[PDB]
Amino acid sequence: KSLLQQLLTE
Amino acid sequence: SADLRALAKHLYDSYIKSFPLTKAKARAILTGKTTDKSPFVIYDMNSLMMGEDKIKEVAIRIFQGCQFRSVEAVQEITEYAKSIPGFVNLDLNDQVTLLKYGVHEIIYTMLASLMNKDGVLISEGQGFMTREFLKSLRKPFGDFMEPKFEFAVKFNALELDDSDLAIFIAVIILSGDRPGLLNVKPIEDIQDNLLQALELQLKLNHPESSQLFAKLLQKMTDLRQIVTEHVQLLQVIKKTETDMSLHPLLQEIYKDL
Ligand SMILES: COc1ccc2c(c[n+](C)c3c4cc5c(cc4ccc23)OCO5)c1OC
Numbered sequence: 657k658s659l660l661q662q663l664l665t666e
Numbered sequence: 667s668a669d670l671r672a673l674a675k676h677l678y679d680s681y682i683k684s685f686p687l688t689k690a691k692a693r694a695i696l697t698g699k700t701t702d703k704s705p706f707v708i709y710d711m712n713s714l715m716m717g718e719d720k721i722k723e724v725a726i727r728i729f730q731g732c733q734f735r736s737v738e739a740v741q742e743i744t745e746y747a748k749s750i751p752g753f754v755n756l757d758l759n760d761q762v763t764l765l766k767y768g769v770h771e772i773i774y775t776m777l778a779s780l781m782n783k784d785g786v787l788i789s790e791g792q793g794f795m796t797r798e799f800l801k802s803l804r805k806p807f808g809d810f811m812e813p814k815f816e817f818a819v820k821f822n823a824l825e826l827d828d829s830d831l832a833i834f835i836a837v838i839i840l841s842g843d844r845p846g847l848l849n850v851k852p853i854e855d856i857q858d859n860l861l862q863a864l865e866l867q868l869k870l871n872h873p874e875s876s877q878l879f880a881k882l883l884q885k886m887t888d889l890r891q892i893v894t895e896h897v898q899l900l901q902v903i904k905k906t907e908t909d910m911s912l913h914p915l916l917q918e919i920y921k922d923l
Contacts, residue, residue, distance in 0.1 A: 659915050660762045663744045664754075 670863040673751065674833055677863075680749035681832035684742050687790055688828045692753075695791050696782050705787060705794040714799075720792045725807035726910070733913045735788070736773060740765075740915055743772050743839075750836050752856045757848050764853070766919055767844040770836050770896065771889040778818035779831070786811070805900055817892055821885060824878065830871060833864040834882055838889070855913035897923055 711724065721731070742763060747790045748754050751763065760913065780787040785796040800811045826834070836917040840857035842850040868878045900920065903910060912920060 658762055660740075660744065660765050661758065661916050662747065663741060664758065664761050664765070 667866065670866045670901065672780075673859065673863045674829065674867050677750065677832040677836055678829045680746055681828060681835070684746035684749070685776070686742075687780070687787075689776075689826075689831060690828055692780050692787055692791065695787060696780075696794075703791065705792055707785075707794050707796070708788075709799050716791055717858070720789050722909075725803045727906075729807060729910075733916060737913050737915050739773050739776070740919070742768050743757075743769050743835075746835070747839050750839065750856070752852070753840070756852060758886045760847050760853065761850060763844050763846050764839055764841065767922070767923070768839045768841060769887070769919060770893045771838050774814060774839070774889055774892055774896075775821075775831070775835060777814060778821045781815060781818040781822070783815070783819050786815075806899060810896070810899055813892060813895060817888065824881060824885075825872075825875075827871070830864075830867055833860060833867055836860050837864055838886060 691700075695703055695705060698704065706713075706715045706720055708714050713869050714728075716726065732874075747761070747765060753764075777786070780791075780802060784798070785794050785799075797811070797815055801808050837860045840853055840860055842854035842857060847853065864882070865879050868875070868882070872878045897920070
């Protein structure tokens with residue numbers, strides 16, 4: 657759900 | 667000492683990779699010391715219409731252009747935070763929390779790099795919006811930017827360069843006092859090291875600037891008041907301004923805050 661979380665694992 | 671300079675250089679190199687528009691490139695544009703450009707100047711409604719192609723009532727369209735630039739900045743700052751040694755090994759929820767509560771302080775910091783007392787570079791340096799024009803927007807829109815201009819003029823008088831800013835931004839992101847952090851100690855340990863690198867950077871790069879380090883610590887306090895004040899203004903906007911709606915990334919950041 658978190659957008660920041662997906663950004664951080666790219 | 668040598669380890670502190672290698673950390674400082676690593677952070678500068680990542681900063682250059684993460685942020686396409688640096689303070690050095692921006693002051694060139696602002697002072698007109700560049701070859702390409704110039705930026706299109708937006709100083710009234712007529713020049714706003716003309717400059718539109720770079721890149722709903724006016725206050726609104728402007729406010730909603732700022733969201734997308736803030737959204738791009740969040741992404742660049744995220745990329746930058748992942749280069750700070752130790753940061754990607756932190757609990758992933760703590761990374762999210764550090765960026766959530768830290769990204770606006772960093773945005774306001776780096777926005778000073780694009781400002782002088784007369785206005786602000788926008789669209790990756792392709793436009794310049796005057797301070798006067800922005801204050802002439804209807805309440806409460808005329809007030810968003812002014813306290814950022816007031817911050818930036820005093821911040822800019824410190825004369826930091828990109829090398830200084832890289833470490834200063836990293837210190838701010840590694841703040842162990844953000845709400846809901848699960849494991850504070852590893853974050854303060856990293857920040858303790860970034861603080862010592864910052865101190866040595868200021869000593870060597872600004873040898874005649876007495877107490878510069880103490881002055882930047884105080885700017886970190888001032889950033890928190892700026893962000894508090896900005897959140898209040900946003901609150902007032904949710905309470906009126908009918909159609910308005912944050913970008914989903916901003917909604918995440920603002921959720922609670
Ligand atoms: C991250 O870089 C940024 C980030 C935010 C902004 C920005 C420039 N402007 C004009 C605004 C802005 C202008 C406004 C406003 C709200 C605003 C909110 C943010 C920005 O409401 C009244 O007019 C910018 O410059 C390159």
